[PDB]
Design a protein around this ligand. Structure first.
Ligand SMILES: Nc1nc2c(ncn2[C@@H]2O[C@H](CO)[C@@H](O)[C@H]2OP(=O)(O)O)c(=O)[nH]1
Ligand SMILES: [Ca+2]
Length: 104
């Protein structure tokens, strides 16, 4: 069964921790990757009720199970905070425009 389901994409806990670790390292190093400069701040415009404190950052999680290294980041993101705590897994799939919904 999937720990998070983002549309048709199925992720386990280990998928999320792996993506999160890569993103947090770049954030700590003050480095970014990709044309959209990930990781970057996640403003929470959607008003998600995350159980950890802001500020939050987002980083792509990819269904191929590879770590994001540039190119298209697809629809799915992990959202982590300054303490490297996971806030949530969110996706553009199933939401209008460039909005997000949470993966379930
Ligand atoms: N919808 C949304 N986009 C955000 C937020 N914070 C930053 N962004 C970035 O702003 C772009 C314009 O909304 C979004 O598509 C998203 O980039 P990503 O595609 O990199 O996730 C947020 O809280 N909500
Ligand atoms: Ca996997």
């Amino acid at each position: 069964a999937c720990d998070y389901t983002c549309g048709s994409n199925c992720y386990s806990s280990s998928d999320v921790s792996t993506a999160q670790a890569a993103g947090y390292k770049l954030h700590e190093d003050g480095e970014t990757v990709g044309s959209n400069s990930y990781p970057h701040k996640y403003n929470n415009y959607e008003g998600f009720d995350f159980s950890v404190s802001s500020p939050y950052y987002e980083w792509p999680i990819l269904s191929s199970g590879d770590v994001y290294s540039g190119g298209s980041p697809g629809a799915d993101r992990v959202v982590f905070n300054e303490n490297n705590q996971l806030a949530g897994v969110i996706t553009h799939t199933g939401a209008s425009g460039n909005n997000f919904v949470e993966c379930t």
